[PDB]
């Protein structure tokens, strides 16, 4: 459930990017409150993401080809579906009678994905979902063949639905360059609560602005609440505001007549103590973009496993229990500490 | 020494506006850590009924599995607590969901091609195109019929769209209510927002009679300041009417004549509700959860 | 995809006021400042959600393979 | 006002697709040097 930007250009609609929404609207309090949001890190709300907040998904399809092995004059050897001289159960709980799975059935690693019973070994040798994430099957397509009209299929495509909620580490960005990872899903009860009950959804770091100079975010946040209350959607084309026509003076007549503070500030209170904060908190609505690459395919762990033959040393591969490499300048820092049993 | 029977002589309540969805009431002379703790319960620790478990039988439509499983769970089901008990999910399904913990719901919606004559509206072009969340039907399981003769399960907000369907598509699922609290998942929140604010106090310093009194209205919301003449130069009618704007602290003529600041002991609790329970009783589900969060410390053995 | 059910900040129920919202615009020709206001939305966290909502479910429902053509 | 979201024009365009003319014409002008350079292999003066 993406929204559209309240603060935008007018060379937006003329390309019509409402036919491709990309990002969402976050109530943003520019505040250092947690201590968990430094080195550009930021703090999602819990009950925002439990209500869905950039609730993303993903897809991927997979070719299932028996004809990749099959030669030209090779007869049509192996066939999708089970056979006889067998009965392994619980494959019937993942698959259907043609040896192709029910659409929408929760698969994992170790689980059968299709049953192809050959006739040269007389046993159903199923193949298996070759990844480590909780997937489903979105749709299956039974693909025909070209050079004939009539032979059985040896090509299936199967579409997977990997769900991907915003876990901790999943990177954000607004439209200005203010990227920063989702550091801690703070519970919403202990987030700051404002005058009315308006609790922020992403807490962003004020110690991430003065070395960044992203002041177009300093005005979009006061423009965003100016469009949100009044029900307009303000233009933010570059070079509309001259130096005599300060936008903080432009978006300030709107918020003065609205009832909020002229400078974009809002007096929040404290969600962990109950007393009021000292300052007035800069609160608005900005437009955030949940990025592609996440931490949910980055980390790994290895204690023991596959040695090699030439080396008797462990193995590379994130899908293969990848071994951490202690390398050249890792060798020459253990010496530099003087330790020679953290190197032995 | 501070007696707690002096606390009773310094604790007043002004209920301003009490409605069956919101209540706006005052708490005079209580602490920001006691009145926080009431507000700390009413979001989270109050029990409220929703659905964790969505048993799909059939759904071929566009809105996929886990998504419509999600948006059933966000529906406030008008189910009074204390008419269910707590699940004990340490044991599997055979006795995990009873007839006494779980309220069971079902959805059966099929969309067809409806022939109609003229840009054409989708409610007349199809039969049952929009899955409204008044289509959730309470299945009375077990003995849930001898006592639900005046409290049948209805969803509290019935007109929620859940899905839009095209001909061929159907949705057949089975839903299970679970009794929960708002620390685990947001969907068991018994409230829209149970927040307070604190009573501001506006102190004039220099008398601002005349032209300084008439321009002094427009810095504030209107029903706050009362100016008449030289005599009756200004006063404050009700600062409760006044949200904290601080517009007057933009003006240079008035930036030294006035003092804004809260009265630190007048909590204006305005508790709304999502729809499950009345606000003026979920506050009683926080004056008696606190009282029964102390007994779990007090009547409890101090270990080692 | 469809209107969200609850507001992402406060916790008020939002989804029953989207098709009840276009029936203050296509018919009464109201401005959004009254159209959102006449429904009951009065906190801007739950008032940048019925205003802003893209509602791309309609562009999905045109792609149905459970129907002839 | 300043500018607008079109919350009745998008719903009339999502539900009722344009039978007549492609809306948002600048987008077809952006990709146009690819198509226009490929139209000129078989079409134009001298073929």
């Amino acid at each position: 459930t993406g929204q559209t930007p309240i603060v935008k250009a007018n060379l937006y609609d003329d390309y019509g990017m409402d036919n491709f929404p990309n990002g969402f609207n976050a109530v943003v309090a520019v505040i250092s409150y947690t201590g968990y949001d430094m080195d550009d890190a930021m703090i999602i709300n819990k009950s925002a993401d439990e209500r869905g907040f950039g609730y993303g998904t993903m897809y991927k399809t997979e070719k299932v080809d028996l004809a990749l092995n099959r030669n030209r004059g090779d007869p049509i050897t192996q066939h999708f579906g089970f056979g006889n001289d067998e009965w392994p159960k619980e494959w019937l709980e993942k698959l259907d009678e043609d040896g192709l799975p029910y659409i929408g059935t929760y698969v994992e690693e170790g689980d059968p994905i299709c049953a192809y019973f050959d006739d040269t070994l007389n046993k159903t040798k199923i193949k298996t979902y070759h990844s480590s994430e909780p997937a489903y099957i979105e749709e299956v397509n039974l693909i025909g063949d070209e050079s004939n009209k009539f032979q059985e299929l040896q090509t299936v495509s199967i579409k997977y639905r990997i769900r991907r909620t915003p876990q901790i580490g999943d990177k954000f960005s607004s439209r200005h360059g203010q990227k920063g990872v989702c550091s801690r899903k703070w519970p919403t009860i202990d987030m700051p609560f404002s005058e009315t009950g308006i609790q922020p959804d992403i807490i962003i770091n004020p110690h991430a602005f003065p070395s960044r100079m992203t002041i177009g975010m300093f005005v979009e946040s006061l423009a965003g609440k100016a469009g949100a209350l009044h029900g307009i959607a303000q233009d933010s084309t570059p070079w509309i505001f001259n130096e005599d026509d300060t936008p903080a003076d432009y978006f300030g007549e709107q918020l003065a007549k609205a009832g909020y503070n002229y400078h974009g500030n809002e007096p929040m209170y404290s969600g962990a103590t109950g007393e009021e904060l000292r300052a007035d908190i800069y609160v608005g609505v900005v437009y955030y973009q949940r990025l592609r690459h996440m931490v949910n395919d980055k980390f790994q762990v290895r204690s023991t496993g596959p040695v090699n033959s030439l080396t008797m040393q462990p193995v590379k591969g994130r899908k293969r229990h990848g071994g951490i490499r202690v390398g050249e300048m890792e060798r020459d820092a253990l010496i530099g500490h003087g330790t020679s049993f953290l190197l032995q | 020494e501070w007696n707690v029977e002096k606390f009773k002589k310094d604790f007043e309540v002004n209920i301003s506006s009490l409605d069956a969805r919101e209540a706006n009431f005052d708490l005079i002379n209580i602490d920001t850590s006691i009145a926080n703790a009431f507000r700390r319960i009413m979001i989270s620790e109050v029990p409220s009924v929703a659905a964790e478990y969505v048993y799909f039988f059939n759904n071929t439509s566009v809105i996929q599995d886990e998504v419509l499983a999600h948006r059933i769970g966000l529906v406030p089901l008008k189910v009074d607590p204390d008419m269910l008990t707590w699940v004990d999910s340490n044991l599997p399904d055979d006795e995990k969901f009873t007839d006494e913990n779980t309220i069971v719901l079902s959805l059966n919606v099929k969309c067809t091609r409806n022939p109609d004559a003229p840009s054409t509206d989708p409610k007349e072009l199809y039969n049952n195109a929009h899955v409204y969340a008044r289509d959730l039907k309470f299945e009375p399981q077990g003995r849930q019929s001898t006592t639900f003769a005046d409290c049948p399960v209805v969803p509290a907000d019935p007109d929620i769209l859940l899905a839009k369907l095209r001909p061929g598509q159907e949705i057949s699922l089975k839903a299970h209510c679970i009794l929960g609290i708002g620390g685990d998942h947001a969907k068991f929140s018994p409230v829209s927002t149970a927040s307070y604010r604190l009573l501001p106090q506006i102190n004039i310093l220099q008398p601002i009679k005349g032209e300084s009194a008439r321009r002094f209205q427009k810095c504030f919301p209107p029903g706050v300041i009362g100016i008449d003449e030289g005599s009756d130069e200004a006063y404050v009618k009700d600062a409760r009417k006044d949200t904290v704007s601080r517009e007057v602290l933009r003006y240079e003529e008035f930036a030294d004549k006035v003092k804004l600041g809260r009265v630190r002991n007048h909590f204006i609790f305005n508790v709304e509700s999502a729809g499950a329970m009345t606000p003026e009783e979920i506050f009683f589900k926080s004056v008696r959860i606190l009282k029964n969060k102390a007994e779990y410390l007090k009547n409890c053995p101090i270990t080692q | 995809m469809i209107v969200p059910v609850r507001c992402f900040s406060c916790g008020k129920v939002v989804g029953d006021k989207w098709e009840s919202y276009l029936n203050l615009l296509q018919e009464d020709e109201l401005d959004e400042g009254t159209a959102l206001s006449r429904l009951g939305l009065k906190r801007y966290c739950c008032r940048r959600m019925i205003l802003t909502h893209v509602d791309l479910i309609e562009k999905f429902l045109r792609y149905n393979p459970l129907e002839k053509r | 006002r300043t500018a607008d979201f079109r919350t009745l024009e998008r719903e009339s365009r999502f539900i009722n697709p344009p039978k007549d003319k492609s809306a948002f014409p600048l987008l077809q002008e952006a990709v146009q040097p690819h198509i226009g350079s490929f139209n000129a292999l078989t079409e134009g003066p001298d073929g």
Binding site: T196 | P221, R240 | - | -
Partner: peptide, 24 residues
């Protein structure tokens, strides 16, 4: 340069929690 146009006809859009629209 014609200014960024001051949009006309805007009202007070936040009030006291329990005091909606009695202000005229």
């Amino acid at each position: 340069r014609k200014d960024v146009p001051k949009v006309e006809g805007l009202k007070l859009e936040h009030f006291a929690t329990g005091y909606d629209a009695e202000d005229f």
